[PDB]
A and B are shown apart, each in its own frame.
With several copies, the nearest count.
Chain A
Amino acid sequence: KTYDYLFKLLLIGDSGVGKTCVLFRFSEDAFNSTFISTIGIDFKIRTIELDGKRIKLQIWDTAGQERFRTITTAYYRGAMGIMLVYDITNEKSFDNIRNWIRNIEEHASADVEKMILGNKCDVNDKRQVSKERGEKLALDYGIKFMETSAKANINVENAFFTLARDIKAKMDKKL
Chain B
Amino acid sequence: GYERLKEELAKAQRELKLKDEECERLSKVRDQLGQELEELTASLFEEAHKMVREANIKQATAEKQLKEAQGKIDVL
A-to-B contact residues, CB < 8 Å: 8, 31, 33, 35, 38-39, 41-43, 45, 58, 67-71, 73-75, 77-78
Known: A33-B52, A58-B42. A71 touches B47 (CB 8 A): no
Size bin of chain B's contact surface: 20 to 34
Q: List 16 A-B contacts (CB under 8 A).
A: A38-B47, A39-B43, A42-B45, A43-B41, A43-B42, A45-B46, A58-B42, A70-B32, A70-B36, A71-B36, A71-B40, A74-B38, A75-B34, A77-B31, A78-B34, A78-B35
Min CB distance, A43 to chain B, in Å? Answer: 4
Q: Determine if A78 and B38 form an interchain contact, defined as CB atoms under 8 angstroms apart.
A: yes
- B-side binding surface: helix, strand, loop or mixed? helix
Q: Determine if A70 and B39 form an interchain contact, defined as CB atoms under 8 angstroms apart.
A: no
- A-side binding surface: helix, strand, loop or mixed? mixed
Q: Which residue of A lies closest to B36 (CB)?
A: A71
Known: A31-B56, A45-B46. A75 touches B51 (CB 8 A): no
